[PDB]
Amino acid sequence: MVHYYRLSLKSRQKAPKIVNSKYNSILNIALKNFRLCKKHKTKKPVQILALLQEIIPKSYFGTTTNLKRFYKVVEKILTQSSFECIHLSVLHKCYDYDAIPWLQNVEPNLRPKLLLKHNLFLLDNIVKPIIAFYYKPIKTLNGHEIKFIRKEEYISFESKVFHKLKKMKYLVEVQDEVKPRGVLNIIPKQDNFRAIVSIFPDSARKPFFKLLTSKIYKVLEEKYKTSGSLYTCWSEFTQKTQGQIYGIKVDIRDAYGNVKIPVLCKLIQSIPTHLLDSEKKNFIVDHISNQFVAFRRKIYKWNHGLLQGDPLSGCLCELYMAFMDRLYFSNLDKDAFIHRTVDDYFFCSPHPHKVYDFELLIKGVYQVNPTKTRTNLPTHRHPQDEIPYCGKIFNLTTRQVRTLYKLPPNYEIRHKFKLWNFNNQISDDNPARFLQKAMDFPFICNSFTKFEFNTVFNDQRTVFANFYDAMICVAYKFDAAMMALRTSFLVNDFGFIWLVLSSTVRAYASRAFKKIVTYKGGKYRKVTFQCLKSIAWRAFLAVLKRRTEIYKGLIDRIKSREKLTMKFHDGEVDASYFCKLPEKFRFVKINRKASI
Ligand SMILES: COC(=O)c1ccc2c(ccn2[C@@H]2C[C@H](O)[C@@H](COP(=O)(O)OP(=O)(O)OP(=O)(O)O)O2)c1
Ligand SMILES: [Mg+2]
Ligand SMILES: [Mg+2]
């Protein structure tokens, strides 16, 4: 009931020093070569595919077709996203079987599965290990993007921040050979770093930690400030505020690190016992004072605030921050806009001086991160009016809210979408259910909200732009699915994709219509299912025309048999934007070619 094979490097097994009776010994040439190359040292010019071509002799494949069928999957490994798989299928499907020299002497009909086992050995014992020898993979945290960084430079970088953490006092060796919470990982930021904990998977206390986060979130709700709700706050502020809106958003530097455990333990102790009893109070306090992690092999106590990656860190940081809000941010204009999430504050006032004062107050309380500040304050050199907060983009002048999309230059969009899941596999001969489960609406629901579809503060223009921008993300993940199909499912008839595509267009259009009807306001004019449907169709054509040397069939099918005419009951909404790719999507990389 396992159909997939995952591209992750942990799938690797320890390279045996010579293969045994079961396996053909043709590959021990390559097992020898893995050692002959690992006893090599280089410092700059390295191609991964090229050198693998020399560890594994061409004689294992015998021809030029089987070898490229193998190097497709090694390429996919090189360009992997986290939790991305291939079908075990691809390691035996449509091979030339009597062109290899070494199953020419085995049962003609038993070749598939033991060639599969052989290829499995190749990749698990040589391919992913040679990579893991030359590179570390790191998660960008931008989707499932994995960047490959040569371990030589990364060990150095890890060493420099370990330097900073022991040259400071943030990390003190305890050597109690004490059970550590988990393994410390250093992960690059931009020009910076981030120190994280990977918890040891010991699922005896996971429901306990969940009970605890639950309890103190209930404590947050009843004890601390009901923080309104972002949509409500923005709605009512923009309605009551006639004039030009001034605003600022600031990010607190090292939020988890600058929590003061003294103050935190006090706050924990102050909680009424009917909400958090004495034992769990003491466990939590002991827990946040006593945080041990393993790094290299020496054990270290973490002294710098709450430590990221720990299950209680989010809830305790919000407890601390709500306390700080009560202490320092209680006296601001009740007719002004204020909202916080975690380390991000968003303040707005028609009064410039009041926005200026809020910034001064914040910079007095916390150490802000200047890089991340966004404001139309005249005091700042480069005023913005679009400020990003909570994955939205609030326009201070127009009061419009657009979905914010994190898509850096030359970011491969396929890294946002988790096409495969190991726990629920799908066999190679059912592409329809795979496409379906990829087109399930959760992955885009977060840009289908009142924030996007209200006609209370947002124009009809803006609502429709939000819908089209969501359907672009949707069509992109549809194209990602199709790539997975053509290179793992290796599809025969594409008859199901027309039905899947029609179904998704119509269902997402229906959800959009219902959301828009639900949040009607003073700037509603009229919205139509025909218009929504054709917006979505245009969104799909916009994506598919970047490979219209593939999708010419589908392109022309939808243009021939579908309604795309764009008529609004408004003269305000520019339709030229609903025909091109939006400026945020037209440069995301769609080709999956082995970089380093
Ligand atoms: C590596 O995978 C993970 O498991 C993972 C990623 C991010 C995580 C956790 C746990 C908490 N978070 C982040 C904590 C951070 O504190 C906060 C705000 O993020 P941010 O402002 O961007 O970083 P921070 O303020 O500390 O420092 P900075 O401002 O750059 O100085 O959400 C686990
Ligand atoms: Mg921050
Ligand atoms: Mg932030």
Numbering used by the authors: 1 to 596
Excerpt from the paper describing this PDB structure:
Telomerase is a multicomponent, ribonucleoprotein enzyme that includes a catalytic telomerase reverse transcriptase (TERT) protein and a noncoding RNA molecule that serves as the template for synthesis of telomere DNA. Telomerase functions as a unique RT that uses a specialized, noncoding RNA as a template for telomere DNA synthesis. In highly proliferative tissues (e.g., during embryogenesis, germline and stem cells), telomerase, the enzyme that synthesizes telomere ends, is reactivated to extend telomere DNA to counterbalance telomere attrition. Although TERT contains additional domains, its catalytic core is structurally homologous to the RT domain of HIV-1.
In doing so, we have identified 5-methylcarboxyl-indolyl-2′-deoxyriboside 5′-triphosphate (5-MeCITP) as an inhibitor of telomerase activity. To identify the precise interactions that govern 5-MeCITP binding to telomerase, we crystalized the T. castaneum TERT-MeCITP complex along with a nucleotide hairpin that functionally mimics the telomerase RNA template-telomere DNA substrate. The structure of the complex refined to 2.8 Å identifies density corresponding to an unpolymerized 5-MeCITP residing in the active site of the enzyme. The triphosphate group of 5-MeCITP is coordinated by two metal ions in a manner that is structurally similar to that of a nonhydrolyzable nucleotide analog bound to the active site of other polymerases. The modified nucleobase of 5-MeCITP adopts a noncanonical configuration in which it is rotated 180° as compared with the expected orientation of a native dNTP forming Watson-Crick base pairs with the RNA template. This configuration is very likely governed by an inability to properly base pair with RNA combined with selective interactions formed between the methylcarboxyl moiety of 5-MeCITP and TERT. Specifically, the methylcarboxyl moiety occupies a hydrophobic patch formed between motifs 1, 2 of the fingers domain and T-motif in the TRBD. The positioning of the methylcarboxyl group of 5-MeCITP is coordinated by interactions with Ile187 and Ile196 of motifs 1 and 2 and with Leu141 of the T-motif of T. castaneum TERT. The unique positioning of the modified nucleotide coincides with a displacement of the nucleobase of the template away from its canonical position. The α-phosphate of 5-MeCITP is situated at a distance that is approximately 5 Å from the nucleophilic 3′-hydroxyl group of the terminal dATP of the ssDNA that is being extended and is therefore too far for nucleophilic attack and incorporation into the 3′ end of the DNA.
